[PDB]
Amino acid sequence: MVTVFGILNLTEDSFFDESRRLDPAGAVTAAIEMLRVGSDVVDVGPAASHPDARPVSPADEIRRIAPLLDALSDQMHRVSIDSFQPETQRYALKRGVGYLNDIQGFPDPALYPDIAEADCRLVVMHSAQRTRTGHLRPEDALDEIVRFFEARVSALRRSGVAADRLILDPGMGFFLSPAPETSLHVLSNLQKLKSALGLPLLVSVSRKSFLGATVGLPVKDLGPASLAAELHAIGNGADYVRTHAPGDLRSAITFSETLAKFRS
Amino acid sequence: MVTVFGILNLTEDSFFDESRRLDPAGAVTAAIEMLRVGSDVVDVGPAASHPDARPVSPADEIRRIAPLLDALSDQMHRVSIDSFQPETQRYALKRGVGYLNDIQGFPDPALYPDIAEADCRLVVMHSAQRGHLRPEDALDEIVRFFEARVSALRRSGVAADRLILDPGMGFFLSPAPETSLHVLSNLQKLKSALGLPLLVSVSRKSFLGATVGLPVKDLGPASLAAELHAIGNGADYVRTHAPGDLRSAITFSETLAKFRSRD
Ligand SMILES: Nc1nc2ncc(CO)nc2c(=O)[nH]1
Ligand SMILES: Nc1nc2ncc(CO)nc2c(=O)[nH]1
Ligand SMILES: [Cl-]
Ligand SMILES: [Cl-]
Ligand SMILES: [Cl-]
Ligand SMILES: [Cl-]
Ligand SMILES: [Cl-]
């Protein structure tokens, strides 16, 4: 069984014009449709990853996700909030979203008691931008990721966060290293990571730099390479996938699972 | 190593308007372009596929492909002619195409001595038309079919190393998806039993539509998944509607495999 997270970036190109003004009604419509075809969970991202973007204040993040939580009130369990701001996480916490997705892997223990009371699940992502000899090399990646999760899981578990609420994301692309080889090594040997961690795995390879470096294509021609990467990840222990093309991935999952039933 | 055939259907909706008249210049432009990104080979199909279509005469087939061979004469080894008409096949031989792709599997021996003198390769496709074939009967029938057909080609002088075998997919096997699924799922035994290179064309076929429940133009992703499985199970050639997509997934898969560390 695979659970598909569909990416909803509230600050992507299609949500503003020359007035630099964001469209809340447009995002609500997109999120409803996503949940209708393709996305098991919609992953709402209020922070900008634009090269010139300044940090987004927590208050702006909350104002951006609040209208979306309003429209999805009767299906909170299909909502994930993609944010590293603890105040945004706290706000989404109390409103009862299904998931908190943190690229910093919840490093502030002052938020742990608030998380233990709630029932949401946590996507705990490893980020190698923590520095020793330099960038994360392939031969060290697996041990680094295991030691990272060993420490962060046991910290959350010490504060009352049950283990069955935890989803572990190894990180991909530049979150692992500027070198594509490190992401390729981790993805290819994902099964060994899954066995050593013993908890469900999520990956998000869709449109990442290391795909572009591998096939030599710009970010919007990476749909097919992403699908190949995702199907490979699913076959090697990934239980969750975060992707820009969720309906595409689901229909490929359905074909793969149906085809496996005919193997002799 | 995979060779990707890009489908060029000369009678798809993009190549005619209300004049019911085919546009060869648009197809030439499409062919040159798909060769530039993705397609190792372009599979040129002049025979209609419409539900209300009558058969296409060989003269019309030849008229439709002639401008394409004109535009690709300096790279004929990258050209496959998708036709079952022996007149169209003879014409293509005379202009030295790289491949003859016959969904009837070359059943007319009158053509063999002309093929034997050429140096093209042949895509010999198996079909249930000679229409229900069950999964339990599928593999033995495909093997027995090719054993007779391959021997008959070789005995008329067509060398074995020129042959590419296609099991057929979709309605060429059965109206039910189960037979295509069984054959695709167990493609490796087919390859080892036949011992010749294998081509499959699953792209957009009915059995994908029935498996994922999607119309023919939402089948890109399911097709890519099917294609990647076929490649991992002995397919040396793949005929697809999205050749640039497939080549990019193959490049990623081949690169990823190099990072698998022992056991
Ligand atoms: N869990 C997770 N979330 C992400 N959010 C944003 C981005 C990139 O903007 N990447 C990721 C990712 O790789 N994993
Ligand atoms: N070799 C080959 N050719 C085909 N041409 C047309 C179509 C469908 O129009 N299918 C095939 C196929 O499955 N294999
Ligand atoms: Cl409501
Ligand atoms: Cl999609
Ligand atoms: Cl021989
Ligand atoms: Cl038919
Ligand atoms: Cl093989």
Residue numbers in the entry:
A (entry chain A): 1 to 130, 135 to 268
B (entry chain B): 1 to 130, 138 to 270
Paper text:
The sulfonamides (sulfas) are the oldest class of antibacterial drugs and inhibit the bacterial dihydropteroate synthase (DHPS, encoded by folP), through chemical mimicry of its co-substrate p-aminobenzoic acid (pABA). Resistance to sulfa drugs is mediated either by mutations in folP or acquisition of sul genes, which code for sulfa-insensitive, divergent DHPS enzymes. DHPS catalyzes the condensation of para-aminobenzoic acid (pABA) and 6-hydroxymethyl-7,8-dihydropterin pyrophosphate (DHPP), producing 7,8-dihydropteroic acid (7,8-DHP); this compound is further transformed, ultimately leading to tetrahydrofolate, an essential precursor for DNA and RNA synthesis. All three Sul enzymes adopted the (ɑ/β)8 TIM barrel fold also shared by DHPS.
We determined the crystal structure of Sul1 in a ligand-bound state, and the Sul2 and Sul3 enzymes in both apo and ligand-bound forms to resolutions between 1.74 to 2.8 Å. We identified electron density in the active site of Sul1 corresponding only to a pterin ring which we modeled as 6-hydroxymethylpterin (6-HMP). The 6-HMP molecule formed hydrogen bonds with the Sul1 residues Asn101, Asp173 and Lys212. Additionally, the plane of the pterin ring formed van der Waals interactions with Phe179 and Ile103. We noticed that the Phe residue that is conserved across Sul enzymes (Phe178 in Sul1, Phe179 in Sul2 and Phe177 in Sul3) and localized to the active site adopted different rotamer conformations depending on ligand binding.
